[PDB]
Amino acid sequence: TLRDEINAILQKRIMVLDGGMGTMIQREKLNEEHFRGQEFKDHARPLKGNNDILSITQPDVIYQIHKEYLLAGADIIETNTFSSTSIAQADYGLEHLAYRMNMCSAGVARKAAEEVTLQTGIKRFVAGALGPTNKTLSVSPSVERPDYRNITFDELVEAYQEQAKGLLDGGVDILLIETIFDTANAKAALFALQNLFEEKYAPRPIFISGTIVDKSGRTLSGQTGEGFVISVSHGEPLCIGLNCALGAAEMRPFIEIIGKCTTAYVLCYPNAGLPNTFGDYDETPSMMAKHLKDFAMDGLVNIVGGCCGSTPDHIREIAEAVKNCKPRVPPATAFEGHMLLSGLEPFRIGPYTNFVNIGERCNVAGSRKFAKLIMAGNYEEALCVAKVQVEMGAQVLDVNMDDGMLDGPSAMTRFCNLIASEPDIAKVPLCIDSSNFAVIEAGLKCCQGKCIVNSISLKEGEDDFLEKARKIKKYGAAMVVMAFDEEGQATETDTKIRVCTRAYHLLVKKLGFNPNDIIFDPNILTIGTGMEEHNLYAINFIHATKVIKETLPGARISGGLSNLSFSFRGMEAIREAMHGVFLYHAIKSGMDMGIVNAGNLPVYDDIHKELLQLCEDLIWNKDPEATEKLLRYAQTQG
């Protein structure tokens, strides 16, 4: 296929990509009549500056620019479709034509590519460019309305799907999500591409390239390079990298950092230096070629090119410079065994990582303060609960909005949108927890990074679980699988192990799920309720954690720690004591993380020795009278 053909070329030599199409169009200096052409002569809105309309109004100019770039030495030419969505064309009144413009841009690029391929013998490729659009999902249009968004995930999915329909019907060889200002927009474009590839169309290679705005190393939406790579690698792009907004000397460290984090190829086409006082990126082609050759000799990049300021002279110099350079070899074992989560910053859970705290207090059903703030509509002050959780040591935040008084999806969308507006909250990943899958989808469609979906299970059959898991994989997030099946909630050790194994072998063998993205919850259940059947639950969880960790490769283990101490509510210190003891024994068992009260977990050594012994007796059922003894000990604290 096309992906194999491109991958074969990328292994032997470095590939050169198009260049500054807008810069070439600027030297043409077309006027309003030239932009309109004959067909749009009486169009009610101005079309000057709309470079995408030239594909139907001035095909000759676009074709000549493509031929110039290809004869310069470029191997891949982007289509003139940077603003060819219905949303981007809404400024020009050309919403209905987004399919037509994409089709004609693909055709006019393909004719030039075929002509140059015939004339030179070197096969050329056409990359369908999908622009970032002026609308942002992860950033509010106004400072005073942080939770407000003027565009939704579904609208952008529809627009990008129409654009990609136009591009694929025109016959592009590569799809290129470029100049990503918002990682959520890139995820929406990937979602649309997955819809198209799973409905009718054979897959095409996908090139993803972000944009580091400043020397701070973060995109426009605030995500770092590693976080961006983690977020957008669920679609498995053939190439990843950066473009524009920076010169090579300013882009080199970020390119190295990205190259060391992904097993995909690295594409880098930066601006031709900094703009001068006149506004022209004046870095000469020779200096650009030398900078890209320094990039290539170090093994930093695999695809080179130029963003704004790159004329075909720059492309000729770059192509002749990188002609003899040896390509980058991707690291095949990039963070093997780790679980790769992300918010604004990467969060990797490896085999030698400590216990990961997940903040339980952002739960409507299980936090009195959070529920009190949410039902009043005061999400602004309910964000302070997550702030305190992160300040207190929570590495992941668990979000739950399940209540009959609340509209689930709307509340979860608003809370995720408000979370994204706060930097220190947004750097840690989120845990999407809800019994309704609509709320889970609403949470996944508002997240910038890679989150965890909580509470998926075999409760409603194999087919429903499989469909939900397929949707989660398409969204590309991590997911927790409960030990819950058609017979009910798992309580015995053997039943927990059987349910977890059955869930695991479905996901990996049939759905092809990533084993490092699966988290198993053997259902920590309350003990010491006064009922003798409930006294073995902690032991069952610990043994199930043992067997699951030593029999299911790559699968993590988590659970709700506070569930174990429901019988002793109001007696907080004893609850923290059992939490410490159970955490000690479960981490010795293999519990990788858990939804826990982040700052209220004492270490096993500073627990009071008498209370330590009482909690050990209760949890391990060493004494049939343990629960009443612990209650009496609590009563002695009067």
Ligand SMILES: CN1c2c(O)nc(N)nc2NC[C@@H]1CNc1ccc(C(=O)N[C@@H](CCC(=O)O)C(=O)O)cc1
């Ligand atoms: C049900 N349990 C759970 C689970 O067992 N397994 C998974 N995967 N996910 C989850 N998510 C929800 C839940 C864990 N979260 C919890 C569990 C318990 C509490 C809790 O004890 N809250 C206190 C009040 C909290 C307060 O106001 O301070 C209470 O009185 O009940 C608070 C949060």
